[PDB]
Swiss-Prot record, chains A, B:
Entire protein: shown range: 1148 to 1194 of 1435
The protein's name: Integrase
Zn finger spans (Integrase-type): 3-44
Binding, Zn(2+): 12, 16, 40, 43
Protein role: Catalyzes viral DNA integration into the host chromosome, by performing a series of DNA cutting and joining reactions. This enzyme activity takes place after virion entry into a cell and reverse transcription of the RNA genome in dsDNA. The first step in the integration process is 3' processing. This step requires a complex comprising the viral genome, matrix protein, Vpr and integrase. This complex is called the pre-integration complex (PIC). The integrase protein removes 2 nucleotides from each 3' end of the viral DNA, leaving recessed CA OH's at the 3' ends.
Length: 47, 47
C-alpha cells in the first residue's frame, strides 16, 4: 500500500497523465493508481 | 481492494466527511479511504 505508492510516486510527468501504465507497471488495481492521481493536485484539479 | 470499496462505498453521508472513521471501521490504510473520497465528486470538489 504505502510502500507501492512511495515508488510509484514521482514527478508530475506524462506517466501521471496515464495512470493505467503505472497500474500495469506495478500490476496494482486502479485503486492505488487512482489514489496517487488524487494526491497530486495537478492531476486532480485541472485549472 | 475493490471488494472493500464496494462495502465502504455508500451515500455521501457524514461518514464521507470523516474518512478516518471509515479506515478505522475496516482497518484499512488512508489509501483506500482516500481513493473513495477522490471518487466521490462531492467530497473531492468543494464548490
Ligand atoms: Zn501529477
Ligand atoms: Zn461523498
Amino acid at each position: 500500500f504505502l510502500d507501492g505508492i512511495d515508488k510509484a510516486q514521482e514527478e508530475h510527468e506524462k506517466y501521471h497523465s496515464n495512470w493505467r501504465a503505472m497500474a500495469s507497471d506495478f500490476n496494482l488495481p486502479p485503486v492505488v493508481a487512482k489514489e496517487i492521481v488524487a494526491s497530486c493536485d495537478k492531476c486532480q484539479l485541472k485549472g
